[model samples]
Target chain A: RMKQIEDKIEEIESKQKKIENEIARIKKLLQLTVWGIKQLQARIL
Target chain B: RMKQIEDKIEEIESKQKKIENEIARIKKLLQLTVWGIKQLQARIL
Candidate 1:
């Protein structure tokens, strides 16, 4: 049996936003320089 | 609903890799450096 969001859906959304942002920031910092080079390649030629 | 949070809890284990790597690398380096410092210091002092 699954429970429904009902009235607290807004609250859950807020919490999810915060958690998503937190994870996003941490992931960015962790992969910043490491990921950026592969993602953006400037053509010197 | 309640099922949403329940699903997230199961996902938490896989989501902690960055935090776990941070902790594990430190532990491994600490353990690695301990013996090196000891052997080097014993020869010097």
Candidate 2:
């Protein structure tokens, strides 16, 4: 029983880590997108 | 031991849900930012 619990916990932890990494990647992409918008704005006027 | 494992699993599940929601939100925001960039591009030429 204890071993089963350990396996479940590990599985959840790995899944959680993947979600976190995905969030980090999306955040970085958002930052770059915002920066690109700003550069375009600077050239407009 | 079983109860402790259950509680830990619940905690991790809740945390996982929160992260998933965050990713959804950031994705929406990224979509908006990309649209805004396109609008600016349209006026450039």
Candidate 3:
């Protein structure tokens, strides 16, 4: 039973890491999008 | 102890829920950013 719990904890930990990485990637994409919008604004005005 | 392990599991599960919620919010933000880029592109071109 203890071993099973340990396994579950390990799996959850791995999932947490993946979620964090995904969040970081999304943040980077959002920053790029903002920059792209700024560049377009500069061109239009 | 079994109780302690159970408590830990409960805590981890709560954390997992929060992470999932954060991921969902980030996805919405990313979608908005993509839409903004498209709108800007339309105006520029």
Candidate 4:
């Protein structure tokens, strides 16, 4: 049981990494998009 | 062993819920950011 739990935890940890990376990229893209809007707004008005 | 695995799965499921929520919120925010960019670009150009 202990060994199985170790494997399960590892699996969960791997999934956690993927989600973290996904969130990071999403955050970066969101920031860029908002920044782009601000820059464009500045140029136009 | 079976009960232990069941409990572990439950704990992981709870964590999955939290992470899924975080991802959903991030995606929503990203969508809003992108939408704002498109609206601004449309008006400006």
Model 2 spans > 4 angstroms off: none
If you assessed candidate 2 against the hidden native complex, which CAPRI class would it receive? medium
List runs of model 4 lying over 4 Å from the truth.
B1-9
Those runs of model 1 whose alpha carbons end farther than 4 Å from true positions after fitting are A1-45, B16-22
Ranking by TM-score: 3, 2, 4, 1
Complex DockQ per candidate: 0.03, 0.78, 0.76, 0.67
lDDT of 3 by residue, A1-45 (tens): 879988988988898888889878887988888888788879878
Report, to 2 decimal places, the DockQ of model 1: 0.03
Give the higher-DockQ candidate: 2 or 4. 2
- After superposition, candidate 3 runs with Cα above 4 Å error: none
From the highest lDDT down, the ranking of the candidates is: 3, 2, 4, 1
Clashing pairs in 4: none
Q: Which lDDT tens digits does candidate 4 get at residues A1-45?
A: 779877877878888888888978887897798689788968877
Report residue B3 deviation for candidate 1 (angstroms): 2.6
Looking at model 4 chain B, which ten-residue stretch has the lowest summed lDDT? B36-45
Candidate with more favorable, higher DockQ: 1 or 4: 4
Local distance difference test scores for all models: 0.53, 0.84, 0.86, 0.83
TM-score for each prediction? 0.38, 0.81, 0.82, 0.73
User: Residue B5 of model 1: what lDDT?
Assistant: 63
lDDT per residue for candidate 2 within B2-40, as digits (tens), equals 799889889898997899789788978878897887888
Looking at candidate 3 chain A, the ten consecutive residues that score lowest on lDDT are A36-45
